[PDB]
Symmetry: C2
Amino acid sequence: MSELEKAMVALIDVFHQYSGREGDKHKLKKSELKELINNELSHFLEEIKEQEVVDKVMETLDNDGDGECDFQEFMAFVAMVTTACHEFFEHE
Amino acid sequence: MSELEKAMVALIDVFHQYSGREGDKHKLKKSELKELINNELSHFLEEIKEQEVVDKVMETLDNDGDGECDFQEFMAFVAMVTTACHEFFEH
Ligand SMILES: [Ca+2]
Ligand SMILES: [Ca+2]
Ligand SMILES: [Ca+2]
Ligand SMILES: [Ca+2]
Ligand SMILES: [Zn+2]
Ligand SMILES: [Zn+2]
């Protein structure tokens, strides 16, 4: 696989690692989301240590309002974090 | 770097690799988009050999309409391709 292809597969892999932990094996509940952010985004996102931060991050990404993050919502999440990182570094 | 953070940096890096070839250094034009898909998505998407295909792809992902693909547009393309890979290996 190319680097891009590997990146895509890694997105799908990290989602499933965290979503299959409890409940709907194909959705992130708040606790899986917090653990995904804490373990896998330590370098781009401030560690979450407060319930209200978990709550607000979910409220933000949850477009269909089932209180969980599904794959399509996770994709939007990756896009917002990636985009924020992209801009944070420009310009020079 | 976690494999997620690795994947994020790869997205930013592959985009600039292609967008900085020609014209605006921060957007993909059709030729840059074509070569991106042909070289970097060779295992996920059919090779682009026809002008009507690159045209359609750019039209499809250019949500603003500047005839080019910026980083935001590119991120939605990666989401579309990632979703299709996800479904392919399920069911
Ligand atoms: Ca779950
Ligand atoms: Ca949801
Ligand atoms: Ca360009
Ligand atoms: Ca555009
Ligand atoms: Zn799945
Ligand atoms: Zn840039």
